[PDB]
Every structure is written in C-alpha cells, then in structure tokens.
C-alpha cells in the first residue's frame, strides 16, 4: 500500500531522470545535425547556376521554370526562398544538375 | 506511518514537476526533429 | 545453381576512393579508366584496397584501353612495392552521364568478368560530386540464361541489399535487366580519419588570435543596426498579433542576429583575456 | 519409481509432449489467409515470407499441409530459401521428438542442379528446431553430423542445429566442435558457428569463451561472421547483469561498428527485465549519438528487452525515437516496442506503430507491421481494438502490387506471427510465474537478425509458449474436464475463418489466453480440484476427490 | 592424411621464389621439399630462414614441419607472410612474426601436423619460415619434410 506507492514514485522518478538525460543528448547531437543539414542546403545554392523564368508556381514546393536553356522542367522551389519574391517571368537561379529553383 | 505520507507527497509533487518539464523537452526536440526532418 | 546474395558489398577503401576521384575530375570532359586491386574475400564481400589510372587513349573506355604492358608493369612494381593484390575490377567516369553502364561498358564488364566471375564495374560521376553527395555505383552483371529462364539475378537473404533504392536515369539505361547495382561501403579506419581531419583543423593559433578589433566594432555596429531594423520589424508584427485570432519572422531573422552577436562577441572577449593573462 | 516420474517431469519430455499434444488438437490455422499470401507471391522474397509465415503459423501443430498440398509451388524456391522452406519444417514439428530422426527420413537427399547442401542443412537446423532447449539425445547425433560434414551450407545448418540443440548446456565438446568450425573462417559457416558458440555458452560469463569470440571477431575479415559472432557474444553474457559491464565498456569503445552492435546487444541480454537505468542510459546514448546506423538501431532495440518486464513504461521512452529523422532509429523503435509489449497488447504501443505502417521508408515499415504482429498475438477485437484493422492492412500490403518487396515481407511474417501455432500460442519474455524465459529471449533476439540472414527469423519459434491450462490427474494423464470462463465467450474466441452467454465451458486442454487465464475458475461439480490456483494457467496436478473411475482424454495422432 | 575439404599445396608452389639461407651444398632445399629421408641441413648454425612462392594467392590451414629424432627438429618456429622483400636474420629475429610456433616433440614425428591460425594466413603470397632454434640444441638442424596444408583462393 503505502511502501508500494513511495517505492513506484521513486522509480518513476528516476525514469523520468533518465529520459531527461536522454531528451538533453538527443537534442544536443539534433542541433547538430540540423547545423549540417543547414549546411548542404545553403551548399546546394553554390555556383555555378543556370537562369531561367519563374513560369507558373503549382504546388508550396514545386514550381513549372523556363530554364534559358531553351526547356520547361518541371522542379523543386527551396524552402528558405521568399514566396511573395517568386512573381512570373522573374529571373531565378536553378541548379545546374537538376534545375531546382534554387 | 505519517512519514509515509510526507515521503509519498514530496515525491509527488516532484515527479509532476519532472514531468512537466520532461513532456516540455520532448516538444522542443520533436520541434528540432522535426525541422531535422524537413 | 549459386546464385549472387544481394547483400554482397563492395568495401572501398579511402584511398581508392581519393584517387578515382581526383582521376575522374582530372580527365573531364574526357571518359577516363582505370583498375581497381583488392581480393575477393568472400562470396558476399568485395574489397577495393587500391586503385591504379591508366593512360588516356583515343579510343574512349573499352577493353582496348588497358594496355596490357602498363597493366603488367604497374602490377609487377606495385606487388614489389607491397601492394600484390590481384585486378578486382576496373571503374570508369560517366561525367555528368549519371552512373550506369553502356553497350560498350558491358563488353568491357564482360570481358573483365571472363577473368573471374567477381569482379565489379565501378563508375564513378566526377562533375555530379559537388562537395557532400558523391555520384558512385558498382554494377556486375546478369546472365542473359539467368534473365530469359524467369530466375531473377540475385538471391535474397536480408534487407541488406534494398536499403538504397536504383535511380531512374541507371534503369533506364539497363539497370536491373542486364547489370545490378551493388551496395557500396567504405572502409575508414581511425587512423585515415584521423588523417583527413588535418585538412581543416585550424591550429593551435586561430584559438588564440584575436579579431581585427576595427573589423569587430565594425561587424558588432552592422549587426546592431540590422538588429535594429529587425526589432522595429519585430514590434510592428507583434502590434498586428493582438488583433488577429489564430490564423520571413522578423522574430526568426532577430533570434538568428541575437545568436551570432552573443557567440562572435563572447568569443572575442574571452579570447583577448585569456591573451592578456596567458601572454604575461 | 516415483522418481523416475519426477525425472521424466524435469527432463522435459512429458511438458513437452503435453504441450505437442495441446497444439495438435486445438490446431486452429485457417488455410484460406495463406492461399490468399500464395496467390499474392510475385517474387521470391514473398515466397520466403510466405514459407516462414506459414511455419509460424503451424508452430508445433505438425500440420505440413499446407506444404503438401502446395509442394509444386514450393519447389520454384532455390539456393537459401530452399535451405529456409527446409528448416521451416522444424518450426513446424517442434516438439515432436519421437519420430524426429525417422520424418526427416522422408525428405532424403536427391542430386539436382541446386546443390541440395540447402536441403541438407536447412534438414540439420530444422533437427535442432525440433529439440530447441531439449536436444538431450539429438545432440549426439548432430555432433556426428556436423563433423562429418564436408559443405560449407550444411556446416551452417548444422553449426545452427547444433547451437539451438545445446543452447545453455555449455558442453564443451559441441563448444570445441563449433570453435573448430568457425576457426575454418567461412562467412557462410561463421554466422552459424558465432551464433552456435553463443547458443552453446548461454548466460556462462565463460572467460575463455569470450576472449576466443572477440579475438576471432577482431581478427577475421568476414563481416557475416562479425554478426554471427556479435550475436553470440551477447548470448554469451545472458543475464549476468553487472558482471557484463567490463565486456560491455570494452565493446562499447571499439572501433569495428559490428562490435558496437554487440556491446548493444550484451547489454540488452545482460540486463533484460531487470529495467537498469544504467543500462537504458547507455543505450539511449549510442542510439543518439552513434555515427554507425546499425548500431543506433541495436541500441534502439536492446530497449525491449531491458524493459519487457514494465511494458508500460516502454513507450513513454522509445516514443520520440519513433519520429526520429533516422530511419534506423525509427525501425529501432518498432521493433523495440515489439520485443517490450508482445503479448501484451498493449494499446499505446499499438497506437505508436499505426503512423509508423505508412513510414515512407520500406523496412520501416516492415518493422513496424513486425513488430504490430509480435504485441497483437493472440488478441481480440474487443481485448484489443485495432486488431482487425491491422489484419486488413497486412492484406492490403499482400495484395498492393506496387507496395515494396520489404513491406511485403514484413506483412507475410505478422499474418504468420498474427495467428501463430494456430491461435494457441504467444510470446512471453516473462515465464508463468515472473521469471525471464531464457528460450523466449534467445529466440526473439536472434529474430530480430532476421535483418541480416532470413533462415534466423525461424528462432522467433523459441519465443511461442503455449497458452495452455492442462489439467493432470494422479497418474499424470489428462482426465476429461472442462473449466468456466466467466466472460463473453467473443472475448477470447478464435479469429472467424475467412471466405451469448457470461460464461464459456472449455475442454481439456484449454485454450486459455493469458489475460483469459484471470476469470477462469474450475465447475464445483467437478469431481477434480485444481491443486495451483487456476488463475496462474499452466500444467497444474488435478487431486481428484472422488473415487469414480476417470475417462482419459484420448491421445491424437501426429500430422 | 589431410583433413577434409584441403589438400596439399606442392603443386602451387612456385619455384621461382623458394629461397633457403643457410643450408649446407650437399643437403639442398628440394630434400625438405620431397617426401624422402633426404634432409635439409643448416650449414652455419641452427638458424634458418626458408622461404616459399606460390604461384597464385593460397590460404594456409596446418603446415607438416618434421625432422629427425637425433633432437635436431625445430623447435621455435616465427611465420612471416606477403614478404616483399627477402627477409634478413636480425630483423627475422627482431621483427613480430605473423606466427609464433613453439614445437612440441610429437610434430616432428612423420604423424606430426602443426594447426596455424587460419585467420591470419587468408591471402599468403609468399610464406617465410624463421627456424630459430632446435631440440637437441645442436649446432645445425635437420628437416626431413616441409609443405603446406591448404587450399587456392580461385584467384
Ligand atoms: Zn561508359
């Protein structure tokens, strides 16, 4: 009764210990790896890039650009570019390997 | 007997702190997980 | 019959990997090739310990690119070095071609697999390895009897061999109909990562030396003023929060400005005092 | 004379041929799911699946119908999973010692294109199947064979037969046997002689055992023997708890990520059910911090057997790992839930893995699907909701033409688990009376290396203890009595094929789930008295308090 | 003899590269070599340096190194594989061997075949054999039979 709900108190107390220490690792080594994923998106906006015309936006993510190339393509807008900037016909830099809206 | 009690209270009163503060982290890092994710 | 497990690995070594690298950038736009050394250790591992370029010919990358005096010879002096280990196979550079294998890359694979049954047919894409990703694959082969009798290529035995899924431009090329892809692993031992690291470990210096204390102030005052835009940004947005229900932050841009001014200027404080009191 | 009853008792044979009994007569497998699963097979790692699935679901029943009736479609499978169909046949008859030796007589050897050498030792590990934990008189036999083997697949069978038939026993002659085996460095053998020198040496802390299996893990080349070994290690430090720390720290630090996996997994069997806060920090440590996915994952899943004696605290800690960015994290997590609540039922576990059967990672979901199977064993609609959901699902994942291969897999292995050994039996980590079934253990852990060597997931076979109420007169023969379940009789009925009352009267032996086990009392008619309460199930003596004479339950025959 | 599954590795063995230091003109290297009561004898003192080529990459299981009785049978034995240069007496006697061998009396005998560690001797090239010291502590050694037990890597 009384001895059986301290002792279940105290065990939950020291589970919920150890997953504080686990939830403080688990967010230090998340930060980190956000750090890195920061990283290869801000790398996927290196040069070179090709010019194209933003021709029409169909979803949050995916958009229809007119690469200078010639060619429509059917792509991927970053997430990190300001939406209300992608206007028609604006000039926007795309990857070069694969015409991502970069 | 009393002591029991005293004892039962006190660890209850902590372990409702602890988990509040332990539900608190684990939205933070399913927001960090999350952006991770995306 | 034996049939190829999917879980087979090609295990390339660091340096090998460096080294069709650096040829496959060094030859673009040209297709250049080369042979990979390692053992066959077992049936479910192919180990890649070394890899050897060859000269360019005008012929492009066929089985009348490998001289067979330059092979010899490098072998012969390689194995007199300490490196006796046999032709594993031979890897060429699809320059942004994606990686796969054409007509002309399976005679040659077929020509390589007549010399053993393992043997592997890495490719390697030197202009799609920007700096993260690294555009590699390994494929074999398949038995046309093996494919035509209905028996698919490859036996199963573990999830091993799906962990990574075959890209659209190598199926359309003839992945999974006359070539499999094999998965890749590479062998880093502690002591070549503890090697590589050298490349950007600052210095025992760059810990101490302080920032050019114009160019900080200067840096601390751009900073502060954008901050300073930001914070006015921040109190117009906020004033529309009062009067809006549940429905860029300048709040997100302010945090971000906040971090940087915190870490640059305790870093910079910290180190000029460790400075004073460490240098008398 | 007397003693040599309790002898019997003891040495397992008339447990296990009760339980062998029990399992025949209530054989309940409905046919029609698996025409379904063989009408659905494309490929041929369904056709894996499915002959795995369908052992499960006859474990021990000795009903090979379904194989007989389907031998055309059964021989297109070649190589390996021939050697798997083969060692299925062992989960099948498990239990049935008697004819053994003189059944696998049947299936002798023939000369084809296909070596056979996978018929030959998946033949060796389906004998070990059938005297998993009880190989007192096959052990000979399979040491005889193993040393007079010449193939490298049939060494592998019959170092796995061999294992599972010592498992515990720590005999050191099988040990010299499998250690000269694995020292012939073969990565085909060295994940059966790893696995086997684990099984042999179970929980014995055996310092010369160990140092020879981490040096040889350290000195070979042969990944595939990295993981036989790594698993072996593990079992090796069984239940030690503490006294596995120092291993553990040292494989803790190592370099090679396959013996980090095996620090993982040494912490797991060192320390299950004992909820060590020590041992959970460490894990959720490496499976946070570990650059190696698959160590990540085995740290993810050691939780499970750390804490399968509290599910309920289970999946308050392996929640947010479910949702991890790391797909290895996340089927960590599945699984994890799955060793930690199965046969349990647990409705929060369940809820978490819901989400996780639309991962759009393959195995995640095959993880996921898995482990769903291993929680819901047994269970009902109205003991556990979602039930009929999942089984629809696992339909779907059969009959969805585009699903993955592995998706696919895993649905084929939780319809076997879903309805295994007929209905009849269930997966508990715990023994009946609160102690941790070492064969139940062993069998899941080495399940769970389903991931990197199929012919494995048949140890899972170890972990299906019957839930079974056996009624014993004086003479040890099954009298003729029925128990009252006080419960709607849909509560714990079996599943309806595919194409009332308060109380339940059910024969002798009943098929009385674990939780079924609380509410069921014995008739005050009855001219028996149950000796153990009722309410703990099991084999329990019934004193017979009147001198009528007794009608005997009559004995079935095999098949 | 032999155990299962292996065989002996005389037809492997490359001549090219077989190269014993310190064996007296009238007892050459081929009489170790060949199955007969003809001996190799040390010329200068009981330590001997023999090393064998093969043709293709083989992997070593147990090695038969028999002697006489007369206690001039090796005694301490270190292996060296993949040598790519041939091997010197100092460093032989400074340098870790692949294998350490302390022969017992019963391998010399003719029914006498040493186990090696067949972890190690995966892709043996070229196998040296250090023979540092014999029983009888003589001032030379007899071998009357050396081979190899083992199988090809299928190179
Ligand atoms: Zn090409």
């Given at each position: 009764?009384?001895?059986?709900?301290?002792?279940?108190?105290?065990?939950?107390?020291?589970?919920?210990?150890?997953?504080?220490?686990?939830?403080?690792?688990?967010?230090?080594?998340?930060?980190?790896?956000?750090?890195?994923?920061?990283?290869?998106?801000?790398?996927?906006?290196?040069?070179?890039?090709?010019?194209?015309?933003?021709?029409?936006?169909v979803?949050?993510?995916?958009?229809?650009?007119?690469?200078?190339?010639?060619?429509?393509?059917?792509?991927?807008?970053?997430?990190?570019?300001?939406?209300?900037?992608?206007?028609?016909?604006?000039?926007?830099?795309?990857?070069?390997?694969?015409?991502?809206?970069? | 007997?009393?002591?029991?009690?005293?004892?039962?209270?006190?660890?209850?009163?902590?372990?409702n702190?602890?988990?509040?503060?332990?539900?608190?982290?684990?939205?933070?890092?399913?927001?960090?997980?999350?952006?991770?994710?995306? | 019959?034996?049939?190829?497990?999917?879980?087979?690995?090609?295990?390339?070594?660091?340096?090998?990997?460096?080294?069709?690298?650096?040829?496959?950038?060094?030859?673009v736009?040209?297709?250049?090739?080369?042979?990979?050394?390692?053992?066959?250790?077992?049936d479910?591992?192919?180990?890649?310990?070394?890899?050897?370029?060859?000269?360019?010919?005008?012929?492009?990358?066929?089985?009348?690119?490998?001289?067979?005096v330059?092979?010899?010879?490098?072998?012969?002096?390689?194995?007199?070095?300490?490196?006796?280990?046999?032709?594993?196979?031979?890897?060429?550079?699809?320059?942004?071609?994606?990686?796969?294998?054409?007509?002309?890359?399976?005679?040659?694979?077929?020509?390589?697999?007549?010399?053993?049954?393992?043997?592997?047919?890495?490719?390697?894409?030197?202009?799609?390895?920007?700096?993260?990703?690294?555009?590699?694959?390994?494929?074999?082969?398949?038995?046309?009897?093996?494919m035509?009798?209905?028996?698919?290529?490859?036996?199963?035995?573990?999830?091993?061999?799906?962990?990574?899924?075959?890209?659209?431009?190598?199926?359309?090329?003839?992945?999974?109909?006359?070539?499999?892809?094999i998965?890749?692993?590479?062998?880093?031992?502690?002591?070549?990562?503890?090697?590589?690291?050298?490349?950007?470990?600052?210095?025992?210096?760059?810990?101490?030396?302080?920032?050019?204390?114009?160019?900080?102030?200067?840096?601390?005052?751009?900073?502060?003023?954008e901050?300073?835009?930001?914070?006015?940004?921040?109190?117009?947005?906020?004033?529309?929060?009062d009067?809006?229900?549940?429905?860029?932050?300048?709040?997100?841009?302010?945090?971000?400005?906040?971090?940087?001014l915190?870490?640059?200027?305790?870093?910079?404080?910290?180190?000029?005092?460790?400075?004073?009191?460490?240098?008398? | 004379?007397?003693?040599?009853?309790?002898?019997?008792?003891?040495?397992?044979?008339?447990?296990?041929?009760?339980?062998?009994?029990?399992?025949?007569?209530?054989?309940?497998?409905?046919?029609?799911?698996?025409?379904?699963?063989?009408?659905?097979?494309?490929?041929?790692?369904?056709?894996?699946?499915t002959?795995?699935?369908?052992?499960?679901?006859?474990?021990?029943?000795?009903?090979?119908?379904?194989?007989?009736?389907?031998?055309?479609?059964?021989?297109?499978?070649?190589?390996w999973?021939?050697?798997?169909?083969?060692?299925?046949?062992?989960?099948?008859?498990?239990?049935?010692?008697?004819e053994?030796?003189?059944?696998?007589?049947?299936?002798?050897?023939?000369?084809?294109?296909?070596?056979?050498?996978?018929?030959?030792?998946?033949?060796?590990?389906?004998?070990?199947?059938i005297?998993?934990?009880?190989?007192?008189?096959?052990?000979?036999?399979?040491?005889?064979?193993?040393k007079?083997?010449?193939?490298?697949?049939?060494?592998?069978?019959?170092?796995l037969?061999?294992?599972?038939?010592?498992?515990?026993?720590?005999?050191?002659?099988?040990?010299?046997?499998?250690?000269?085996?694995?020292?012939?460095?073969?990565?085909?053998?060295?994940?059966?002689?790893?696995?086997?020198?684990?099984?042999?040496?179970?929980?014995?802390?055996?310092?010369?055992?160990?140092?020879?299996?981490?040096?040889?893990?350290?000195?070979?080349?042969?990944?595939?023997?990295?993981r036989?070994?790594?698993?072996?290690?593990?079992?090796?430090?069984?239940?030690?708890?503490?006294?596995?720390?120092?291993?553990?720290?040292?494989?803790?630090?190592?370099?090679?990520?396959?013996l980090?996996?095996?620090?993982?997994?040494?912490?797991?069997?060192?320390?299950?059910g004992?909820?060590?806060?020590?041992?959970?920090?460490?894990?959720?440590?490496?499976?946070?911090?570990?650059?190696?996915?698959?160590?990540?994952?085995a740290?993810?899943?050691?939780?499970?057997f750390?804490?399968?004696?509290?599910?309920?605290?289970?999946?308050?800690?392996?929640?947010?790992?479910?949702?991890?960015?790391?797909?290895?994290?996340?089927?960590?997590?599945?699984?994890?839930?799955?060793?930690?609540?199965?046969?349990?039922g647990?409705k929060?576990?369940?809820?978490?893995?819901?989400?996780?059967?639309?991962?759009?990672?393959?195995?995640?979901?095959?993880?996921?699907?898995?482990?769903?199977?291993?929680?819901?064993?047994?269970?009902?609609?109205?003991?556990?909701?979602?039930?009929?959901?999942?089984?629809?699902?696992?339909s779907?994942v059969?009959?969805?033409?585009?699903?993955?291969?592995?998706?696919?897999?895993?649905?084929?292995?939780?319809?076997?688990?879903?309805?295994?050994?007929?209905?009849?039996?269930?997966?508990?980590?715990?023994?009946?009376?609160?102690?941790?079934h070492?064969?139940?253990?062993?069998?899941?852990?080495?399940?769970?290396?389903?991931?990197?060597?199929?012919?494995?997931?048949?140890?899972?076979?170890?972990?299906?203890?019957?839930?079974?109420?056996?009624?014993?007169?004086?003479?040890?023969?099954?009298?003729?009595?029925?128990?009252?379940?006080?419960?709607?009789?849909?509560?714990?009925?079996?599943?309806?094929?595919?194409?009332?009352?308060?109380?339940?009267?059910?024969?002798?032996?009943?098929?009385?789930?674990?939780?079924?086990?609380?509410?069921?009392?014995?008739?005050?008619?009855?001219?028996?008295?149950?000796?153990?309460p009722?309410?703990?199930?099991?084999?329990?003596?019934?004193?017979?308090?009147?001198?009528?004479?007794?009608?005997?339950?009559?004995?079935?025959?095999?098949? | 003899?032999?155990?299962?599954?292996?065989?002996?590795?005389?037809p492997?063995?490359?001549?090219?590269?077989?190269?014993?230091?310190?064996?007296?003109?009238?007892?050459?290297?081929?009489?170790?070599?060949?199955?007969?009561?003809?001996?190799?004898?040390?010329?200068?003192?009981?330590?001997?340096?023999?090393?064998?080529?093969?043709?293709?990459?083989?992997?070593?299981?147990?090695?038969?190194?028999?002697?006489?009785?007369?206690?001039?049978?090796?005694?301490?034995?270190?292996?060296?594989?993949?040598?790519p240069?041939?091997?010197?007496?100092?460093?032989?006697?400074?340098?870790?061997?692949?294998?350490?061998?302390?022969?017992?009396?019963?391998?010399?005998?003719?029914?006498?075949?040493?186990?090696?560690?067949?972890?190690?001797?995966?892709?043996?090239?070229?196998?040296?054999?250090?023979?540092?010291?014999?029983?009888?502590?003589?001032?030379?050694?007899?071998?009357?039979?050396?081979?190899?037990?083992?199988?090809?890597?299928?190179?």
């Amino acid at each position: 009764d009384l001895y059986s709900r301290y002792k279940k108190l105290q065990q939950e107390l020291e589970f919920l210990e150890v997953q504080e220490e686990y939830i403080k690792d688990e967010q230090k080594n998340l930060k980190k790896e956000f750090l890195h994923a920061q990283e290869e998106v801000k790398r996927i906006q290196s040069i070179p890039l090709v010019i194209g015309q933003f021709l029409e936006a169909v979803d949050q993510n995916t958009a229809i650009v007119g690469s200078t190339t010639g060619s429509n393509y059917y792509v991927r807008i970053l997430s990190t570019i300001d939406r209300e900037l992608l206007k028609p016909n604006a000039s926007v830099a795309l990857h070069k390997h694969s015409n991502a809206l970069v | 007997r009393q002591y029991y009690l005293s004892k039962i209270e006190e660890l209850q009163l902590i372990v409702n702190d602890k988990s509040q503060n332990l539900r608190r982290l684990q939205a933070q890092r399913n927001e960090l997980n999350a952006k991770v994710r995306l | 019959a034996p049939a190829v497990d999917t879980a087979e690995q090609v295990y390339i070594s660091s340096l090998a990997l460096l080294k069709m690298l650096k040829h496959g950038r060094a030859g673009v736009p040209m297709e250049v090739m080369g042979l990979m050394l390692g053992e066959f250790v077992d049936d479910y591992t192919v180990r890649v310990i070394d890899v050897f370029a060859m000269p360019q010919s005008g012929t492009g990358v066929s089985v009348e690119a490998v001289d067979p005096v330059f092979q010899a010879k490098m072998l012969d002096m390689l194995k007199q070095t300490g490196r006796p280990e046999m032709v594993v196979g031979w890897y060429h550079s699809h320059p942004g071609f994606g990686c796969w294998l054409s007509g002309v890359d399976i005679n040659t694979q077929q020509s390589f697999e007549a010399l053993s049954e393992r043997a592997v047919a890495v490719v390697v894409d030197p202009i799609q390895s920007v700096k993260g990703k690294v555009v590699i694959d390994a494929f074999r082969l398949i038995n046309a009897n093996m494919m035509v009798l209905g028996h698919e290529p490859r036996q199963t035995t573990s999830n091993l061999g799906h962990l990574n899924k075959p890209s659209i431009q190598a199926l359309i090329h003839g992945l999974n109909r006359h070539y499999y892809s094999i998965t890749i692993n590479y062998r880093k031992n502690e002591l070549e990562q503890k090697m590589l690291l050298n490349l950007h470990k600052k210095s025992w210096m760059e810990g101490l030396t302080l920032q050019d204390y114009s160019e900080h102030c200067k840096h601390n005052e751009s900073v502060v003023k954008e901050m300073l835009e930001l914070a006015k940004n921040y109190n117009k947005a906020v004033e529309e929060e009062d009067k809006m229900t549940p429905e860029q932050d300048p709040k997100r841009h302010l945090e971000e400005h906040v971090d940087v001014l915190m870490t640059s200027n305790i870093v910079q404080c910290l180190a000029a005092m460790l400075d004073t009191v460490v240098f008398k | 004379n007397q003693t040599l009853k309790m002898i019997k008792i003891l040495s397992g044979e008339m447990a296990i041929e009760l339980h062998l009994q029990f399992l025949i007569r209530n054989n309940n497998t409905d046919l029609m799911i698996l025409k379904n699963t063989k009408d659905a097979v494309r490929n041929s790692v369904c056709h894996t699946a499915t002959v795995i699935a369908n052992s499960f679901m006859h474990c021990g029943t000795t009903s090979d119908q379904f194989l007989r009736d389907n031998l055309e479609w059964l021989a297109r499978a070649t190589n390996w999973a021939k050697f798997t169909a083969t060692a299925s046949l062992g989960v099948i008859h498990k239990g049935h010692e008697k004819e053994a030796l003189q059944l696998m007589a049947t299936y002798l050897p023939k000369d084809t294109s296909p070596g056979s050498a996978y018929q030959e030792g998946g033949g060796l590990y389906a004998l070990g199947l059938i005297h998993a934990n009880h190989g007192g008189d096959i052990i000979d036999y399979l040491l005889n064979q193993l040393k007079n083997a010449s193939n490298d697949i049939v060494r592998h069978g019959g170092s796995l037969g061999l294992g599972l038939a010592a498992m515990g026993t720590a005999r050191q002659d099988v040990y010299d046997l499998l250690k000269t085996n694995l020292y012939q460095d073969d990565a085909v053998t060295g994940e059966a002689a790893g696995l086997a020198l684990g099984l042999v040496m179970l929980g014995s802390k055996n310092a010369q055992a160990i140092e020879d299996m981490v040096g040889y893990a350290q000195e070979t080349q042969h990944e595939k023997i990295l993981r036989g070994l790594a698993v072996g290690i593990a079992l090796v430090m069984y239940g030690r708890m503490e006294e596995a720390d120092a291993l553990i720290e040292s494989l803790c630090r190592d370099k090679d990520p396959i013996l980090r996996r095996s620090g993982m997994y040494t912490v797991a069997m060192a320390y299950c059910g004992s909820g060590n806060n020590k041992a959970i920090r460490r894990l959720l440590h490496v499976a946070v911090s570990d650059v190696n996915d698959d160590v990540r994952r085995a740290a993810v899943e050691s939780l499970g057997f750390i804490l399968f004696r509290t599910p309920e605290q289970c999946p308050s800690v392996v929640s947010l790992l479910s949702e991890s960015y790391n797909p290895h994290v996340r089927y960590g997590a599945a699984m994890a839930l799955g060793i930690c609540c199965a046969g349990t039922g647990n409705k929060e576990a369940i809820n978490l893995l819901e989400p996780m059967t639309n991962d759009p990672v393959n195995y995640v979901r095959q993880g996921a699907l898995i482990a769903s199977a291993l929680i819901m064993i047994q269970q009902t609609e109205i003991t556990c909701p979602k039930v009929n959901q999942f089984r629809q699902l696992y339909s779907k994942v059969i009959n969805d033409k585009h699903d993955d291969v592995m998706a696919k897999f895993g649905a084929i292995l939780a319809q076997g688990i879903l309805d295994a050994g007929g209905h009849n039996v269930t997966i508990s980590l715990q023994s009946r009376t609160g102690h941790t079934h070492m064969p139940s253990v062993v069998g899941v852990l080495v399940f769970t290396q389903f991931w990197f060597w199929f012919p494995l997931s048949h140890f899972l076979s170890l972990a299906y203890t019957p839930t079974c109420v056996i009624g014993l007169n004086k003479d040890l023969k099954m009298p003729k009595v029925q128990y009252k379940s006080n419960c709607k009789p849909s509560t714990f009925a079996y599943p309806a094929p595919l194409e009332e009352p308060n109380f339940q009267l059910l024969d002798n032996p009943a098929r009385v789930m674990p939780a079924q086990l609380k509410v069921l009392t014995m008739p005050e008619t009855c001219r028996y008295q149950p000796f153990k309460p009722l309410s703990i199930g099991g084999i329990i003596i019934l004193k017979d308090t009147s001198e009528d004479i007794e009608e005997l339950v009559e004995p079935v025959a095999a098949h | 003899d032999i155990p299962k599954g292996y065989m002996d590795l005389m037809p492997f063995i490359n001549k090219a590269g077989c190269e014993c230091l310190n064996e007296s003109d009238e007892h050459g290297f081929d009489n170790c070599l060949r199955k007969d009561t003809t001996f190799l004898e040390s010329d200068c003192d009981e330590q001997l340096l023999i090393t064998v080529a093969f043709n293709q990459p083989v992997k070593l299981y147990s090695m038969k190194f028999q002697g006489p009785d007369n206690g001039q049978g090796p005694k301490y034995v270190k292996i060296f594989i993949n040598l790519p240069r041939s091997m010197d007496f100092e460093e032989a006697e400074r340098s870790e061997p692949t294998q350490a061998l302390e022969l017992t009396e019963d391998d010399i005998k003719e029914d006498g075949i040493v186990p090696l560690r067949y972890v190690k001797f995966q892709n043996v090239n070229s196998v040296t054999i250090f023979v540092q010291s014999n029983q009888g502590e003589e001032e030379t050694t007899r071998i009357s039979y050396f081979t190899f037990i083992g199988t090809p890597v299928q190179a």
